[PDB]
Structures are given as structure tokens and as C-alpha cells.
């Protein structure tokens, strides 16, 4: 089974360099090319470059030679190095394997890179308590930087009826979001509801139990 996974920094300062590793399995890098794609926030897909099985490379010229791709077959790793970052390099970066038609048949999950000189901030998590039969309850995830945060409920056991809202940028320059779920009011006496919040840039992991006030 073909698999790719990116690992990179979430936050990098303007004029510094971006380094991302793509770790692969299920195919030999000696035999197959790996491309890189990015998606700026709210925008479309941009092809950045490729390293072929033979190690030859091709880059989008718009990058002004700031990009290099390299790889080490025995480590099963492909490396993106992008120099002299500016604000508009902020994007989700993907590695991908060309397959059928030379189109991108398998993709990594993507890693969000934000270009900013602002400090990393972990979120505070607060409950959105069910009111005193369908009940709504949730978590408010406040004042974090950069994106993203992930939210699950009961360690992934609760998915039906969950809505995790896109983050909003506050006037402070920090993000906030809420996650809510609707559940039967008759479950409130027997079922514990915990939101699990992760902010990887700050290594923040919060589990917040949400109960009637």
C-alpha cells in the first residue's frame, strides 16, 4: 500500500527557510517520482516541483530558484527545502506520487506552514455547557497561533452530530474556534462528553469534560 506523510514546522519567520520531509512506504523512490504541491489558504493548488526516480528535478519557475528537492532512497525520504520565505509562501504543503496518467494518485495528509514573525500561542479551552429532547454542548478553543487545532469528542468515539467550526482570526491576531455536538437530553445523566483539543505547534493537549453547569 502506497503511503506518504509530511513532517514540517508549522511556523517559520519571514526570510528564513522551510524544510519538510516526506516519508514514504509501499514503493521504491529509485523507481518512482515524487511531486510537491501547495495550497494557500482559501485558494487553489499550485505544483511546486518533482524529483524523478533517477533524481532529475523540475521546478515551477515562479519559485525563482528558491526551491530544492532531494531524497535518500534507503531512508524512504524526500526533502523539500524552500529558502527566503515570505508571507505568500503560507500554505498547506503536500507530497504526492504520480501514478495513473502521471497524475497525482497518492497524497500525503498535508502540513500547514504559516510564515510570520509572531510568537506561537497555545489555546485556552472553555466549556459550552448544555442548557437547563436534543441538547447542544461544545468547547470554545481560544487565542491560539498559528493554525491548526484539531478537536475530537470522547477520543473519537463520538462523531455523529459534531460540528467543528473553521477558525476565525480575531483582532488580536490570534485564532479562535468552537466545536459543538447535539446529543439526546436523556443521555446527559449517563454519558460523559469530553472534547479533546490538540495544538501541535505548542504541544498543547487539553481534554475538557463538558457537563451541565
Amino acid at each position: 500500500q502506497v503511503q506518504l506523510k509530511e513532517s514540517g514546522p508549522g511556523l517559520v519567520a519571514p526570510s528564513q527557510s522551510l524544510s519538510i520531509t516526506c516519508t514514504v512506504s509501499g514503493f521504491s523512490l529509485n523507481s518512482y517520482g515524487v511531486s510537491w504541491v501547495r495550497q494557500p489558504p482559501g485558494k487553489g493548488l499550485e505544483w511546486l516541483g518533482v524529483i524523478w526516480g533517477d533524481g532529475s528535478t523540475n521546478y515551477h519557475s515562479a519559485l525563482m530558484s528558491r526551491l530544492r528537492i532531494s531524497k535518500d532512497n534507503s531512508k524512504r525520504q524526500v526533502f523539500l527545502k524552500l529558502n527566503s520565505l515570505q508571507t505568500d509562501d503560507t500554505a498547506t504543503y503536500y507530497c504526492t506520487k504520480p501514478g495513473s496518467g502521471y497524475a497525482f494518485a497518492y497524497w500525503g495528509q498535508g502540513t500547514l506552514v504559516t510564515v510570520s514573525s509572531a510568537s506561537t500561542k497555545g489555546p485556552s479551552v472553555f466549556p459550552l455547557a448544555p442548557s437547563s429532547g436534543t441538547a447542544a454542548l461544545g468547547c470554545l478553543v481560544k487565542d491560539y497561533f498559528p493554525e491548526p487545532v484539531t478537536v475530537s469528542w470522547n477520543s473519537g468515539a463520538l462523531t455523529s452530530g459534531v460540528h467543528t467550526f473553521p477558525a476565525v482570526l480575531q483582532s488580536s491576531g490570534l485564532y479562535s474556534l468552537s466545536s459543538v455536538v447535539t446529543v439526546p437530553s436523556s443521555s446527559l445523566g449517563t454519558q460523559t462528553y469530553i472534547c479533546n483539543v490538540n495544538h501541535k505547534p505548542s504541544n498543547t493537549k487539553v481534554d475538557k469534560k463538558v457537563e451541565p453547569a
Binding site: 493548488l45 496518467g101 497525482f104 470554545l140 481560544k142 459543538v180
Partner: protein
């Protein structure tokens, strides 16, 4: 470079309706490929070599074209087809993507369910009050949410967020968050959000009194 342009940029289709979207290239290509992206997670290969479906793609999808002119067609729109679709050429360098067609499902009107949440004691402790109004599972997306504090309409102190269409029921949900300092929060008693939506005969108000 071979710039790819997609039309329309945004479209909506009724359930079961035929959908067609186009990709135009600035220079001729031998083959066009297409991806489906849902909620900004990894794109999925959908069609390759103009008309060949990727594994697992349902038969209601097809692709066609030649030269500079390509299209993607869905025989019958289904709720699971709500996504953004991107064309892509790999016939010459640089490899290029079109800007995307966002495809939406036009379903029936559904009124929101409305909930209001006061700030937690924990948050007040630290000096800030966030009051949250939730609009759950509604259609269409257009909704008006107004905050009133002691019956005075608020302005400039709230922000909204809206989900993508739900994968199965195709509705939206929306939050509106009112943010005040603890001090300003304690200058008032009644916090209310008023929701106007085409699914509701008249506006729906949810409120609480501090206490």
C-alpha cells in the same frame, strides 16, 4: 505556461440533476486529469487521461474533451459529490492546475435550531466573556444573526463562522461569538441573539439573564 481556467467557479445542482463543468487550457494537451477535494483535506485523483475513472470513483462520473477543451460530467448529482473539482495537466512543464469549480447541492429549505451559551466561570475569571449563538443544521446558507444586550442592538463586537455543507444532510451550521471584557459583561443583564432565516415564519430569539 499552460494556464488552466475552470468554469463555472461556483455552481449548485439539485439532487439527481446532471452537472457539467469545463476546463480550458491556454495551449492544447493530449490528456486532462481531475481531482476532487472535500473540505480542504488532501485532493483525490478522480479522472485521469481525460476519461478514465480512478479506482473507487462511481460510474456516474465521466470526463471528455480534446485540444484546449475539457469537461467533467456527473450523470446525477448526489450529496456525496459536493466538493471542489480541479483540472490538471501534466503534458508539459510546468505542471498546472485549474482554479477549481466548487459544486454545491441545492436541497430543501431547513430552519435552524438555535442555542445560546453564556461564558464559562473559568473564562470570566481570566477577564473576558465570550457568548456563543449556534444555528444548527439549516439551508440555505443566508442567515441574519443580531446580538441584543438589554435590548440594544450590538455592532462590531461579534464574529461568525460557518461550516461546509454536511456530507449526508447537506445543511450548514453557523456560530456567532460576542466578545466583551468581564467589566462590560457585568454592566448588563440580558444577552440575546435574534436569528432571521427563510425557514422561520418570524425571527427566533434565544436569551439568558446573568445569574
Amino acid at each position: 505556461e499552460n494556464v488552466l481556467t475552470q468554469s463555472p467557479a461556483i455552481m449548485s445542482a439539485s439532487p439527481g440533476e446532471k452537472v457539467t463543468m469545463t476546463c480550458s487550457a491556454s495551449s492544447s494537451v493530449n490528456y486532462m486529469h481531475w481531482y476532487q477535494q472535500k473540505s480542504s483535506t488532501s485532493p483525490k485523483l478522480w479522472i485521469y487521461d481525460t476519461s478514465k475513472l480512478a479506482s473507487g470513483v462511481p460510474g456516474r462520473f465521466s470526463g471528455s474533451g480534446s485540444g484546449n477543451s475539457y469537461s467533467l460530467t456527473i450523470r446525477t448529482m448526489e450529496a456525496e459529490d459536493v466538493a471542489t473539482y480541479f483540472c490538471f495537466q501534466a503534458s508539459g512543464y510546468p505542471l498546472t492546475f485549474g482554479g477549481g469549480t466548487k459544486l454545491e447541492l441545492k436541497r430543501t429549505v431547513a430552519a435552524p435550531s438555535v442555542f445560546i451559551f453564556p461564558p464559562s466561570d473559568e473564562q470570566l475569571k481570566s477577564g473576558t466573556a465570550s457568548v456563543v449563538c449556534l444555528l444548527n443544521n439549516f439551508y440555505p446558507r443566508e442567515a441574519k444573526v443580531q446580538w441584543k444586550v438589554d435590548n440594544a442592538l450590538q455592532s462590531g463586537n461579534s464574529q461568525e463562522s460557518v461550516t461546509e455543507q454536511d456530507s449526508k444532510d447537506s445543511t450548514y451550521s453557523l456560530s456567532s461569538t460576542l466578545t466583551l471584557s468581564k467589566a462590560d459583561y457585568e454592566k448588563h443583564k440580558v444577552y440575546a441573539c435574534e436569528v432571521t432565516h427563510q425557514g422561520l415564519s418570524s425571527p427566533v430569539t434565544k436569551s439568558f439573564n446573568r445569574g
